[PDB]
C-alpha cells in the first residue's frame, strides 16, 4: 500500500512503499496494514492510543506488521537498519492506561508480535514454570491449563484482567495479586533479537542444549532450552535481563515465567474500613503483617470509588457532573455494604495455618474503630470481593473493565507513584493526589497495591475522551502530580507515552546520570536507533531532544 | 616506590611512576604498597590468589591503593583513564577459591575499596533494610547491630564464614541461608563509579532527596538518598543494575540489602541419610516441600567428607594417599554419627505454624529407612548443627574454615556448576563428577544449596598449594568438569580467575550471541578498557583475545 498519513522521520514516500512492498514479500500482505477507530478491549486496536489524553492521532503508525515467527522479526529488523525505519513492538497492546498499541514516535511500523507469534511453548510440572510466545494472554495461558487437566497442579498469576500478554505485562514489570504478583521476578530465561537483528537468549538460556539426532539442523529460534533455562535468571556473568524491561534495547519473543503450584487451600477476604483517615492506621498495621509474611500475596486496598465504580457508572449514583463530596462518599459506602477503604488479599495453603495467618491478620486490623471482615459468600451476587476472589488465585476475569465507564467516553490514564509502607507517607501522597483531582474536577480514584516495602499507588484517572476541556485538565493534572510527587521524595513506576520524558526528568539525581549512562548503551546497540525510539525516555543520539521531547 | 615486579600491558616504567606518584600525592603514602606472601583468611592478601592452582605469582598485582573516599575513586579512575592502567576493584577480598584479590590482569593496580570506606551507612527499622559500603563485613554489620540493640528486631544473612564483605558478596550474586539468602535478589539502590569517572545510583536512587537546608552543597557521594530509594529497586525505565553483579562496569561504592525482620520463632535441624544414593529420594522429597514454603529458607545437603573436614584432617581418619572408599565413609559416617548425606534446615516463624510444617517435615523424609532427626541440642557441643544454628539465623562464625585443612598446605576450588531440583539429575550430575574426581586422584567433596527451582552445586576441590603435581591434576580437573557438565547441559554460577574464560565459552549458544552483545556494552562504558578487564570472560577491544584468553 502506498500513502500513510504520517510517514516515520527523514523517510520518502518512495523509500517507504519499497520498505513495505519489500515487507509484504516477506510476511505476505494478510499480516500487513498501512494506515491512509479506538477498538475495544475484546479488540484492541494497533495504530494509536485508545485512551486519548492528546489528540486521537497524536501517536499514530504509518501501518501495522504481524511478523508469522522469528525470522520474519529478523528479516523486518534489516529492512528497518537498511532504511533507518522506527520500530514499535507490540504483543497484545492492551497498555491502556498507558498508551496502548500507540508507538511513541509517529510514522513507526507497528509490530504486532501477538497475531502469529502464539504458542504457550512449555509447561513444565516438576519445574513448575511456563514458557511463552507475546501472544499468550493470560486467558489463553488459562485455557491451555484446562485443556491439559493441569489445574489441578499449577496456577496463574493474573493482572486485574484476562487480556494483557503473559509476557508482555512482564517487561512492563506489572503487577498481579498471588505470592507470585511481581511479575518481572518471575521470568527465567528470555529470548530476544536485538537492534542488530542477531538472537540472544539470556541466563541458563546461552547454556545451549547438548546435541541429540531428534533437534539436528533446527533454526536457533526453534532450538529447545538447556535444563537450568527457567529455573535460575542469574546464568554466569553480567545480569542483563532487566536491560530489557521498560527499555527499548530488543523485541522480546520468548520469556519463561515461574508458576506456582495449587498452594493445597485457599481462602480470600474483604476488611472494610470506615473513614477515608482509616487509610493511615491500615497502612500502619500492614506494615509487619507483610514483611513478617502474615500477608502472602499482594493485597490492595481500594478507595470505595473503584468498587462503587465495578457497579454502576457515575450517572447511577449521581447526576452530579462535579466530583463527589466527601459526604456523598459515605452514603455510597453504607449504600454497598463497604468502607471508605476497602482491604481485599488471600490465604494460601492448608487449613491449620491458614487459620493461624488468618487470625493474626483478623487480630491486627480490630484495632481499628468499625471494621467489618467478609468472606466471598457473604456478599451480593455482583461483589468485588467474588471477582478479586478468582483473582488472587490466578483466574482471568473482565468484570473490573467497568470503572473505565464511570463517565460517558470512559478513558483511564494510570499516575503511579510509589509510596513508604506507612501511613504517614500514605496519607500525605494521597492528600497531594487528591488536593489535584479536585482543582481538575475529577472524582479520585485509585488502590494501593502492597509491596514487601513499597505500595503501588494507583491514581486511576478516568476522563471522557471526547471532552477537550477535560482532557487538557488530566494533561494539567498528570504533570501538576509529577513534579509535586518528586517535590516529596517520589518518582513514578511507568507511565503512558505523553509523561515518559517528563517522568525520566524526575529521575535525574547528579545531573541525570542515569539517562545519560542509559543513551550511552541505547546507541552502542542500536546505531540507527531503530527500535522503539523514545521509550521511558531514551533516545538514540539521531533523534534531536528539542524536536523529540514533551 | 620505584620499581614493580610486574607492570600492566603497554605500559613504560616512567608512566608507572608518574602514576603511582599521582596516586601517593592524592591518597598519601600510607594507602599504597608497591609490590617489589601468602597469609591467612583474616589477613588477607590482597596481591594475589590465596589458593593458587596456578603459579603463586600468575594472577599479580602491580600496586594496592587504598581510596579513601568516594573522589579518591573518582580521581584514581580519571588517572587510570590518562595512563590507560588496568584497575582490580575489590571489597574485601575473601573471594578464596575463586581467586581471591588477584587480578585477572596481571600488572593492575588492586583498588582496596575496603581499608577505609568503611561504614555502615544506615539501618532503617520500619523499611527492614541497610546500606552498606564495600568494607563492612558479616562480622561488622553484626557487631552493629548488637551495640544498637537490634538483633532484637532485625537478622542478618550470612553466608558459610563472616569475613565476606556483605556488598562484595552480594555482586557476586553469592548465597546464604535465610529466606533472605539470595543476597543480590535482596539488593535495592545501589551507587557506582562509572569508567568514565561519573557516579550513578541505581533504581529509585535516580530519584534525588527534595532539596532542604541541611544537605545543601553536599558532594553527591555525600547525599542523603530519597525515601524509595532502598525499598523498590526497579525505579523507572531500563533496569541496569544486574550490569554490576559479575560484570565489570563499573566500581560499587555503596549498595542497600534488605533485612528481615525477626520472625518471633526459630529452630534449626539435621537430618541424616544413611546411603551414598539416598540423595535421590531426598532431593526427590525437598522438590514440592521448596517449591511450597515448608522450606522458607535456603537448606544444603552435604557430603559426609564436608563435616569431616571441619572436625579433623584427612591424616587423622586415614594414612591413605589415594582417595577414600566407599567403605571407610561408611565407617566414618556411622563414627560421627552423620549419614553419607546430611540435609540441615530451619523453620521461622510462631510455634503454631512451625509445629505444622515440620511434621509434615519429618513426615515426609520418614519414606528413606534409617532417617534420624536432630535438634542442636541432641548433638555433641563441636558439631556441625550447632554452627549452621548460627548461621540460619543471621549469626557468623569461621569454624567451617577448618575444612580447607582436609589436605596438608589447604586450598580450595569451587566447581559451581547449576542441577535441577530432581534427585536423578542431581545423582547424574553428583557420579560425572565423582568420576573425574577420582581420575584425578582426589576425593569428592560437596554441598548442593537449595534455590527454589535451582540447586547450587559446590563441588569443593581441596588441594596441596606446594604440590607441583597435584596443582596439575587439579586445573586437568577443573577443566574437565567444566566441559563434561556442559555436554551434559549444566552450567556454573561463578568461577575463578584462570576459569573464566572456559565457563563463559560454556555459554555459547548461537555463537557467542551473549558475550558479543556484553562486550558491546562494555567497550562502551569502557572505552579506554579499565575497569576489571577479563572479568567473566568480558574483554575490552584493546585486550587481545589470543593474547588474553586461557
Ligand atoms: C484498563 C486497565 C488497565 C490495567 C488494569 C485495570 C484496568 C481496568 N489493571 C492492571 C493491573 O492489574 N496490573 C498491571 O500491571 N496493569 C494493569 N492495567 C494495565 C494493562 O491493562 C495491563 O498491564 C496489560 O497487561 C498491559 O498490556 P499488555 O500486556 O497487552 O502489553 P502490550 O500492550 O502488548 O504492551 C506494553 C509494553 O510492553 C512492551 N513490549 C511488549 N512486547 C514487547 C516485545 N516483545 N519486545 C519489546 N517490548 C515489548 C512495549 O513497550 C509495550 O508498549
Ligand atoms: C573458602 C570458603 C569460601 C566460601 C565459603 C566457604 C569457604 C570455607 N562459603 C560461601 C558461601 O556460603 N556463600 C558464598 O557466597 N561464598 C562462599 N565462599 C566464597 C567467598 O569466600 C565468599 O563468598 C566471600 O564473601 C567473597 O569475598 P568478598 O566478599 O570479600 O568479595 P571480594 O573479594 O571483595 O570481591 C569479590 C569479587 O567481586 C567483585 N567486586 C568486589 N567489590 C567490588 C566493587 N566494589 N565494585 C565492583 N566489583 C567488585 C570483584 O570482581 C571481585 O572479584
Ligand atoms: C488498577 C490496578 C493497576 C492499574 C495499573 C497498573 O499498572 C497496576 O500495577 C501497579 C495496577
Ligand atoms: C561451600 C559453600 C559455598 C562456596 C562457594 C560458593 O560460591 C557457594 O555458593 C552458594 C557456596
Redesign the interface.
Known amino acids: 500500500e502506498f500513502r500513510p498519513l504520517t510517514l516515520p522521520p527523514k523517510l520518502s514516500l518512495s523509500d517507504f512503499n519499497e520498505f513495505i512492498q519489500d515487507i509484504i514479500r516477506i510476511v505476505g500482505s494478510e499480516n500487513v496494514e498501512v494506515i491512509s477507530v479506538d477498538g475495544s478491549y475484546m479488540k484492541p486496536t494497533h495504530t494509536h492510543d485508545p485512551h486519548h489524553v492528546m489528540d486521537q492521532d497524536y501517536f499514530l503508525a504509518s501501518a501495522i506488521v504481524a511478523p508469522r515467527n522469528v525470522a520474519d522479526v529478523q528479516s523486518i529488523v534489516g529492512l528497518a537498519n537498511k532504511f533507518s525505519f522506527p520500530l514499535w513492538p507490540i504483543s497484545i497492546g492492551r497498555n491502556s492506561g498507558y498508551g496502548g498499541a500507540a508507538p511513541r514516535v509517529s510514522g513507526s511500523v507497528v509490530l504486532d508480535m501477538g497475531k502469529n507469534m502464539n504458542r504457550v511453548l512449555e509447561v513444565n510440572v ?4 511456563c514458557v511463552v510466545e507475546p501472544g499468550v494472554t493470560y486467558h489463553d495461558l488459562h485455557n491451555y491449563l484446562e485443556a491439559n487437566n493441569l489445574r489441578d497442579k499449577l496456577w496463574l498469576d493474573v493482572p486485574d484482567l484476562g487480556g494483557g500478554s503473559v509476557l508482555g505485562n512482564a517487561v512492563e ?1 506489572g503487577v498481579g495479586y498471588t505470592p507470585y504478583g511481581d511479575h ?2 518471575m521470568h ?1 530465561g528470555m529470548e530476544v533479537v ?1 537492534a542488530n537483528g ?5 541466563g ?7 546435541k541429540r539426532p531428534e533437534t539436528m539442523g533446527l533454526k ?1 529460534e526453534d ?1 529447545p532450552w ?3 533455562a527457567h ?2 535468571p ?14 527499548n ?1 530488543g523485541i522480546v519473543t520468548k520469556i519463561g515465567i ?1 508458576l506456582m ?1 495449587n ?2 487451600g485457599y481462602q480470600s477476604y474483604l476488611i472494610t474500613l470506615p473513614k477515608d483517615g482509616d487509610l493511615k492506621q491500615a497502612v500502619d498495621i500492614i ?2 503483617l507483610r ?3 502474615a500477608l502472602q500475596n499482594v493485597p490492595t486496598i481500594r478507595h470505595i470509588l473503584l468498587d462503587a465504580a465495578v457497579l454502576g457508572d457515575k450517572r447511577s449514583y449521581s447526576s452530579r457532573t462535579e466530583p463527589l463530596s466527601d459526604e456523598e462518599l459515605d452514603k455510597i459506602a453504607k449504600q454497598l455494604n463497604l468502607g471508605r477503604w476497602n482491604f481485599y488479599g488471600a490465604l494460601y ?2 487449613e ?2 491458614r487459620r ?2 488468618w487470625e493474626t491478620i483478623k487480630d491486627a486490623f480490630s484495632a481499628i474503630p468499625g471494621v467489618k471482615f467478609y468472606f466471598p459468600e457473604d456478599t451480593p451476587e455482583n461483589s468485588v470481593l467474588r471477582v478479586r476472589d478468582k483473582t488472587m488465585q490466578g483466574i482471568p476475569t473482565y468484570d473490573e473493565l467497568k470503572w473505565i465507564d464511570w463517565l460517558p467516553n470512559g478513558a483511564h490514564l494510570f499516575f503511579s507513584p ?5 501511613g504517614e ?1 500514605a496519607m500525605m501522597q494521597y492528600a497531594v493526589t487528591k488536593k489535584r483531582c479536585q482543582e481538575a474536577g475529577l472524582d479520585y480514584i485509585g488502590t494501593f497495591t502492597v ?4 505500595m503501588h499507588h494507583i491514581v486511576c484517572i478516568v476522563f471522557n475522551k471526547k471532552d477537550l476541556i477535560q482532557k487538557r485538565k488530566v494533561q494539567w493534572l498528570m504533570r501538576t502530580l509529577i513534579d509535586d510527587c ?10 503512558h507515552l505523553a509523561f515518559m520524558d517528563q ?2 526528568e ?5 545531573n541525570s ?2 539517562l ?3 543513551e ?2 541505547k ?3 542500536d546505531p540507527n536507533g531503530i527500535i522503539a525510539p523514545g521509550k ?3 533516545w538514540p543520539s539521531q533523534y534531536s531532544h528539542v524536536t523529540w521531547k514533551l
Open positions: 516438576e519445574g513448575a514454570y514489570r518481572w521476578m527465567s536485538l542477531e538472537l540472544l537468549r539470556t541458563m538460556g546461552a547454556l545451549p542444549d547438548p536457533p532450538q538447556s535444563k537450568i529455573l535460575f542469574y546464568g554466569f556473568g553480567p545480569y542483563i535481563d532487566g536491560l530489557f524491561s521498560q527499555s534495547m515461574w503450584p498452594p493445597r506494615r509487619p514483611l513478617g509474611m495453603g492448608p491449620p495455618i493461624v495467618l510509589i509510596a513508604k509502607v506507612s507517607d509491596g514487601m516495602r513499597e518528586a517535590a516529596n521524595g517520589w518518582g513514578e513506576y511507568r507511565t517522568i525520566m524526575t529521575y535525574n539525581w547528579n546520570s542515569f545519560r549512562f542509559n550511552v548503551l546507541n552502542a546497540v521511558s525516555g531514551v
